[PDB]
Amino acid sequence: ASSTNLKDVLAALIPKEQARIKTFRQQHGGTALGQITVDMSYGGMRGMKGLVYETSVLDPDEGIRFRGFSIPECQKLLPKGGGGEPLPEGLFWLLVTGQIPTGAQVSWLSKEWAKRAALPSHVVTMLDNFPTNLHPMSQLSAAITALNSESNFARAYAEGILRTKYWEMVYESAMDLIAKLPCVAAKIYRNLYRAGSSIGAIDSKLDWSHNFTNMLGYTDAQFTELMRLYLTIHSDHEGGNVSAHTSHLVGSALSDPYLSFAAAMNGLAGPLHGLANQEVLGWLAQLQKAAGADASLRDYIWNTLNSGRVVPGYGHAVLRKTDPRYTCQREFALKHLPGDPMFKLVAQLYKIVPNVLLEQGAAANPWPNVDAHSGVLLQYYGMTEMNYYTVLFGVSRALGVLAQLIWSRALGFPLERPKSMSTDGLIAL
Amino acid sequence: ASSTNLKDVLAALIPKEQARIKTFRQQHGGTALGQITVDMSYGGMRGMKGLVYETSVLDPDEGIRFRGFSIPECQKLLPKGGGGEPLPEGLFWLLVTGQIPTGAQVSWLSKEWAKRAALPSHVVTMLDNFPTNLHPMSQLSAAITALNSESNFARAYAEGILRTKYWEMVYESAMDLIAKLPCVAAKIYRNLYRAGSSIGAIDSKLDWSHNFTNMLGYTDAQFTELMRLYLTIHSDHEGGNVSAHTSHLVGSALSDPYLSFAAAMNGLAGPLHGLANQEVLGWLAQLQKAAGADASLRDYIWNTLNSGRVVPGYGHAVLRKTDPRYTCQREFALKHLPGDPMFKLVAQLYKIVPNVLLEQGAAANPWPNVDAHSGVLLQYYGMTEMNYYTVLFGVSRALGVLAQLIWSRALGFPLERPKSMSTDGLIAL
Ligand SMILES: CC(C)(COP(=O)(O)OP(=O)(O)OC[C@H]1O[C@@H](n2cnc3c(N)ncnc32)[C@H](O)[C@@H]1OP(=O)(O)O)[C@@H](O)C(=O)NCCC(=O)NCCSCC(=O)O
Ligand SMILES: CC(C)(COP(=O)(O)OP(=O)(O)OC[C@H]1O[C@@H](n2cnc3c(N)ncnc32)[C@H](O)[C@@H]1OP(=O)(O)O)[C@@H](O)C(=O)NCCC(=O)NCCSCC(=O)O
Ligand SMILES: O=C([O-])CC(=O)C(=O)O
Ligand SMILES: O=C([O-])CC(=O)C(=O)O
């Protein structure tokens, strides 16, 4: 009997995994997986195997994998709206479950996220009174924190539920949060950039991305395709990245999914992290201010470097090759906006930057990351408000971080609480 | 020539340390400080030496140290208001600098934090419109996020300053943030619990704690002493704790001090972390509802345990003995409120809980932590709104987390970005 329900699937899946991690540990918990050095400690855990995070794994050479699904595999395997890009809905199923969803599963997420998309009065109010000089990421983060009012997990906890059921309430709050996100984000968009206009209604019959673009006010049929791709690729990037790790850390203390997501956003807002989005365009924007020669392009790069600044959109803590998320984006531009001068500049930079970065001899990875390519795509379609880009990153990232969050709690992962040391104490060790 | 200035002191101190960490690393960066096991990965980094954090170090047996200054040492060494408890101002100097401040240094922090204490209009507005069912911690966190508008670091960064000067702007924003905190917190207090009343003005001539208590509306001369002690002891607890670690992680991405503090708060708000504050009182509050026997006291404890719940205020990730912060508090009660029935219940529990926890055989540390003792103190003085307690914890914690934050940036600590693994991948390793 019956029809589609992610929660039931999960109910079936949890005990097996539980069982599976127990024996593994019973046999191997004692096993040394690595060592910790002094440089690692001073170095931001660089190179330390610190967390279990199941939804995605980053290979330094190959790049991100969703099951063991690469981006190009996703692109072919995940259901599409009709009509060439993968629906972030399907990605979400994939991440949660480990399996490739059917079109019909996918429709279910769509409807589910449409049903759940509703904003409480206090939230709307706060967003409506925010100053226009308050950054969109700040606006977003405060809004999601303020939504915790509504937390199903925070409520069940307060009621004294057995730990065993945590995942259940986490799941509800995750689905709800993902559902609301586009409304919050679009409301910020509309307030800042389209004063006096309204986000309108969510239509149950559309996919999440399309409802988002409607609320954003974009009609271009290719913009919608761009959106689907964007929100899919920005999903997740393993556990060690600042935003995911923050959610993981905060979630471990049993703060609800809203609070943990919001802290994650404060992390995504940092220039070395998601804000790179924005930083890239601002830098391109300056570049152009000051059709240039490779030599003048190179002078420009050196001047940033010589000034004690980073070249945004290049480098990576883990990647050692060009990010497939970058390629992914380039391949979209080549199809759709090949003559765009911004695009051309970004293509040109790919020829120069890494070479300059190799010359300088500091960056361990001289190749571009996702952020070097995303804004150019947006700007083409009319979305030229750069300080907003990270908000989009923010919306996507919910998909991976919440998908894992549910597992953490299902698996009963404890408080994240490593040991710290001072220099004097290490000196003494 | 001249008078007092923390920033100048720091300017003198930074290069030396810089120098000191460089050679150390030049000789020992390669040195294995420890190993990583499978259980550690699944276990929340339990037992992993993961971070350098200089302001304080936690010993599993002895408990927290400020330089190498214990709580009892602090209590005797740090300047007081006139008149028995240590001023959190002095603690702050201690943490930043490594040295015990003079009364005169201490006065300087006081005046400085009084000068800087001003709330921007949009913040006041938002706080005034917040619903009363929005938790005080949520209210606090959204408020501090919304303050980033004003970030000196976020502004300098945007301007393209050289990395080398980061610490300078971090310091300003830290001093400013610490200054504003009590205004924000008191405003929440006043809105929720004293509708229609106003926080009033900060008086440059008082210490931070006293201005706070005034804004809170408390006149009891002993309440003020309690406050000073509270905000001092709650300061810092090394780097590995959820809140400090979150600030550290978020700060590493170069999100400004406001954003990083706010994320820290989302972490403090979790039940396994600071919210324990509140959880303890709520549990005591229930206990009493349902002058009891040790046997009925024990039945009560088992029922929580059997229900898949934690006994709040007991246990610790790192401590293996009774928290000196607990003793510290007990010693205050014994002096000031020895006949208080809530106090008596908390004294009685200390005789029972750990024994029940030893019986159960799960807790690795069966002894109480700071949170088991703090609320009882507050309730005595009239501050009985338990959902607010974590806000106080929040205010104090700024002291340690911001003191370190400045050093991280001074020392040029990089992005915190460990490697994660999935179970399948570990299975395969
Ligand atoms: C992404 C990174 C933070 C990784 O940091 P890391 O693992 O510590 O880098 P690394 O090991 O190559 O660093 C060695 C040195 O090269 C420097 N370096 C690395 N990338 C860059 C860059 N793009 N421009 C200039 N210098 C750089 C690095 O800052 C350091 O200098 P110093 O020792 O004086 O501090 C870094 O490459 C960077 O700052 N990139 C620019 C900002 C950026 O584009 N961030 C987005 C990252 S990926 C997608 C996302 O997260 O949103
Ligand atoms: C503070 C702690 C999170 C440390 O967690 P940990 O390092 O994973 O604890 P542990 O190593 O003793 O855990 C072994 C087992 O004992 C359980 N245990 C530990 N403390 C408690 C407690 N107070 N009540 C019942 N069970 C407990 C623990 O949850 C676990 O059960 P299982 O294996 O099925 O998940 C924990 O002791 C706890 O949950 N305490 C109650 C909440 C609390 O008071 N938190 C405040 C911590 S200190 C000050 C602050 O941070 O604000
Ligand atoms: O992996 C990282 O450290 C950052 C990154 O590319 C992402 O989070 O998308
Ligand atoms: O050390 C910890 O994990 C928690 C704690 O006591 C604090 O942060 O005050």
Curated annotation (Swiss-Prot), chains A, B:
It catalyses: oxaloacetate + acetyl-CoA + H2O = citrate + CoA + H(+). Pathway: Carbohydrate metabolism; tricarboxylic acid cycle; isocitrate from oxaloacetate: step 1/2. GO terms for cellular component: mitochondrial matrix; mitochondrion. It is found in: Mitochondrion matrix. The active site is at residues 273, 316, 371. Keywords: Mitochondrion, Transferase, Tricarboxylic acid cycle. Its EC number is 2.3.3.1. It comes from the Eukaryota. It is an enzyme of class 2 (transferase). GO terms for molecular function: citrate (Si)-synthase activity; citrate synthase activity; identical protein binding. Oxaloacetate binds at residues 325, 397, 417. Gene3D superfamilies: Citrate Synthase, domain 1, Cytochrome P450-Terp, domain 2. CDD domains: ScCit1-2_like. GO terms for biological process: carbohydrate metabolic process; citrate metabolic process; tricarboxylic acid cycle. Key enzyme of the Krebs tricarboxylic acid cycle which catalyzes the synthesis of citrate from acetyl coenzyme A and oxaloacetate. Homodimer. Citrate synthase is found in nearly all cells capable of oxidative metabolism. Belongs to the citrate synthase family. This is Citrate synthase, mitochondrial. It comes from Gallus gallus.
